[PDB]
Symmetry: D2
Subunit: 302 residues, 4 copies
């Protein structure tokens, strides 16, 4: 909401005068009301002012307090999730308010599935879920033809609380992607590929695996797309295991290990742990012992 004050702050910082901003855009008096936060500001006007100051439209919006995912109701409900995770106590109270609201907006539905995500983790019983989901997804997706970041977010969520086959039908129509709509969007569409790929690999479903690999590679060709490098790495590690599952070939295995280790080296222990675990499982599956190096870390993480 407080865009005007941020405009003032930036203007003064750069030693511009009000006239430098408002002239040919609005009257002096109107502009002062804008800058006082007493008049709301059109996207257009703000975009113009942004040009004049020279600082970036989205940075201004973010300094004006949209960086915080809080200034509206849905935002607050989303922040609520991480609280409820660390303190499952709070679940039932809030979940009872959210379960009915779930189909209000795609955002709400994504929040809902965040609840279910927690419920599965803490063994909490949510009978409603199993009754409703198939019908929910039907309602939400059956006559859909365009999809937005929020749908990919939803799908990552679904992947995390449902069998892959109950999700895959919903995924396939949203890919391939042909435009970036900002780094925020870019990241969302990637997250789905990365999780789906992991699952396909873990299930030894090499056809779906290949698909996800292509879809990701395909993103790289998009204009102004913004690839997550940690993702590029991890997906590359998966591509590496894929070539090993397809051709049990030793360099691919070595490469996979090497990438796992590189996450450790650059301090991304989160990822290191998961990949160490995956690798051990996938090796077990293929009747195979990973390097002592990694079963080392494995047994100590757990």
């Amino acid at each position: 909401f407080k865009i005007g004050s941020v405009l003032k702050q930036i203007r003064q910082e750069l030693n511009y005068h009000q006239i430098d901003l408002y002239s040919g855009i609005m009257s002096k008096s109107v502009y002062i009301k804008v800058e006082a936060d007493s008049r709301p500001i059109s996207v257009e006007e703000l975009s113009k002012f942004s040009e004049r100051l020279g600082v970036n439209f989205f940075e201004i919006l973010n300094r004006a307090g949209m960086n915080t995912k809080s200034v509206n109701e849905t935002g607050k409900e989303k922040l609520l999730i991480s609280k409820i995770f660390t303190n499952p106590d709070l679940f039932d109270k809030n979940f009872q308010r959210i379960e009915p609201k779930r189909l209000t907006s795609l955002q709400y539905f994504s929040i809902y599935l965040g609840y279910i995500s927690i419920a599965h983790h803490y063994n909490i019983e949510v009978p409603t879920f199993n009754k409703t989901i198939t019908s929910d997804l039907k309602h939400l997706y059956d006559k859909r033809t365009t999809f937005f970041g929020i749908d990919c977010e939803i799908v990552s969520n679904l992947l995390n609380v449902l069998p892959y086959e109950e999700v895959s039908s919903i995924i396939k129509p949203m890919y391939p992607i042909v435009d970036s709509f900002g780094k925020d969007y870019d990241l969302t569409i990637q997250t789905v590929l990365k999780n789906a790929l992991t699952i396909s690999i873990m299930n030894r479903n090499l056809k779906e695996a290949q698909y996800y690999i292509n879809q990701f590679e395909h993103l790289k060709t998009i204009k102004n797309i913004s690839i997550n490098g940690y993702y590029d790495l991890e997906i590359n590690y998966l591509k590496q295991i894929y070539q090993f599952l397809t051709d049990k070939n030793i360099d691919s295995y070595l490469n996979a290990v090497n990438i796992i280790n590189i996450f450790k080296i650059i301090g991304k222990e989160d990822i290191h742990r998961s990949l160490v675990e995956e690798l051990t499982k996938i090796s077990a599956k293929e009747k195979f012992t990973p390097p002592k190096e990694v079963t080392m870390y494995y047994e100590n993480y757990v």
Copy 2:
């Protein structure tokens, strides 16, 4: 610009009715004008509507045509750069119009530095530059206390067309960062660090190099920060060369080479070729022959 039609498109797609959007926000009639793109829309109204649809405010703005860096005059001028790079022909004409406008805004200055960057690359003579920059930078930065993404952008540009010492003064006040203002912002501030660190390492300036490493590792601690993985890697390769230049230590050297290789593996040949080059040079400086692996690639893809 066309936010209203995007609202509509998304509305219908989700099978919301107009009332679902506008009620308790504006009159039915006024909404219809918004949706028709005939009435402008306040940030606050749009934010509200975004909540209603369930799709993210920024995504909507970007579908509405802000993802293109072209809907305003400064944007177009920015696009012009890559054109003029690939066909230096066009330089003179445009640069004549831009050199004068360079202090109009930070954006214009950054654009101006892009032209200089090109001129350097194509040996084009730009006498104005050497006369003006010290003065320009003084104008721009002498009485400055808060800095925005665009300043970091400018700083990366400067690093790339001026000696380090001529820029370091300008950099140091902008760090440490203490807040993210979006992934756009977050990338800009990292890019400076990366480019500066690379130069500090390449100059064997280990004090500055450490500073940049620290400023990068600090970013990690910022809330909602969004670290570039490719940078994380590259920086890390630099950290590795750093421990090697301080302690002439073999593991460090091997890790550096390993990282070089990983970029190769993941298809980042741009980066792979730069790092191979660096490593070669740093090695030569320390009277040292890099693995045959790396000098092989160097000769069939750099020499």
Copy 3:
């Protein structure tokens, strides 16, 4: 043959006089006959003289022409083999004189097996072989209780021209070794182990494989034993495969590859080539692709 002349040569080199050699061993006159090569010399006398000069008994023997594997008839026939290898032309003529003499001495049988090794390699047909071997082996080994270097040598030969099962019975009673009888002896008894272990590994016969590994490790504890380092290395590489085949374990595979490379690094191309090849085959069998590094030499050696 010419030991006396070597004694003179060494004696004068060291500025001893004849008396310094012969005194308390034989008369002046007799010694001069020995030194002229007109009287033969007892092992005991030569040993004593060896002590007085200070140069080593075997060195003197070897300088007197025992280094050359030629000064006797069997020696010559052994040398003959490598000639007949490089020009199979000469086979039939010689092989016709040898095949009948093959049970004259263990030496002769070893030479005969050399011919068969050649015949196998150049596809020459030797029907006599298949008819006689089982009988031959029976004749040679049925009532044997001690074994000599030559037997080991024979066994290596056998391993190289027969299936393992037809040989293993003959091998088993020759191990464990408990005495060294010189470096010549020591080498022979190791060669058998190495070949046998290679075969076992190749056949995935892990029980016999481990037996051979143990027999080799046992040699190491023998007093004055003389272990061949190239063997130690190669056997170690095979131990490393063994652990891999028993436990599909990656460090073992990498070590094995590492050893292969070490042979290349030190210029032992012969060995490098065969190990590259083996590893390739072993990898094939376990549905596995060796590092690209080694599949390069496998193609370009061929």
Copy 4:
């Protein structure tokens, strides 16, 4: 000494009759005395018999008790050394007997130098040594023109108890080697090069180091030479350090390290330790930190 019995044992083992051995060599009765160990046996006869049996001349001699380095006085005195090493108590008594006999034969000198080696290790004072060696070495080598294994043995010994400079002049004339005189000889000549190369590398004397490398690589061209693989490896490691000292180059460093590690992998911990230590010292000398892997091994080797 007991050759006759060995001949009998072998004869009977192979089911030869006396006549098969003695015919055209000696009378039946004579042969019986030979086989009884009542008549001594000429090298030439023994060689002939060796042919007839089909087992190797040297093996037989070794089975007859020459494998033990004990059946003569000098032999015993050499065995004494390892005893006196593990219990320096015994030193003074024995050394008093040996110090005066040291110039009796090269063998005795070699033994004598083994005493000095011990003395040096246990800080025992041997003033005689420093008085006499220069003159001793002058006495032994001033007028020499050919050299035998024992001289190389002596030179290894001297390298180990004297400064390099005081020994080099003595080494140079003995190389390059042009003939193998058996595996025993072959090893002795290699040992000197190894040790000398080590010292040259450790003193950073790259000219001598290169000389020794060349001398060793020359041996490999010798006909019937028998190269020690462990030495081949270690000298290769040294070559590898040599390239690194000459042109501070990373792949050579890497390779040296690798070799060090191979020794460990094949269980040769004696050598592993020495090479780890050397590498650490050379590294320190060049202002350089070896891999943490190897300084972990230096940390506890103290």
